[PDB]
Amino acid sequence: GSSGSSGNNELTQFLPRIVTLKKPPGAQLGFNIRGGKASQLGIFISKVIPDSDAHRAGLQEGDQVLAVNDVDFQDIEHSKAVEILKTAREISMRVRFFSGPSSG
């Protein structure tokens, strides 16, 4: 199953956002994913096509992918992360700010 929240909310602070993609007919994600081999690492926005749904969705090299379509992306293979996204008709992963206000 799948459940969400409807209405209206806008309080950016430290909450994970939802980057949903529609993906047009004849598209290909529009970005790559890095991190993940065997250890665990994480699935982050390796690269984003400068003219894709993600680029528009507001994706930025760094937006860590917590989970994708419920499935967690904390301990998953790269290919899987690539496959899932692809296979998955509709992309709906959980991302969140993974960078402080410039340490120092």
UniProtKB/Swiss-Prot annotation:
Keywords: Cell junction, Cell membrane, Cytoplasm, Membrane. Residues 18-98 form the PDZ domain. It is found in: Cytoplasm; Cell junction, Adherens junction; Cell membrane. Mediates docking of ADAM10 to zonula adherens by interacting with PLEKHA7 which is required for PLEKHA7 to interact with the ADAM10-binding protein TSPAN33. This is PDZ domain-containing protein 11. The chain holds residues 37 to 127 of 140 of the full protein. It comes from the Eukaryota. GO terms for cellular component: adherens junction; basolateral plasma membrane; cytosol; plasma membrane; pore complex. Interacts with ATP2B1, ATP2B2, ATP2B3, ATP2B4 and ATP7A. Interacts with PLEKHA7 (via WW domains) at zonula adherens; this interaction is essential for the interaction between PLEKHA7 and the ADAM10-binding protein TSPAN33. Interacts with SLC5A6. GO terms for molecular function: enzyme activator activity; transporter activator activity. GO terms for biological process: biotin metabolic process; pore complex assembly.
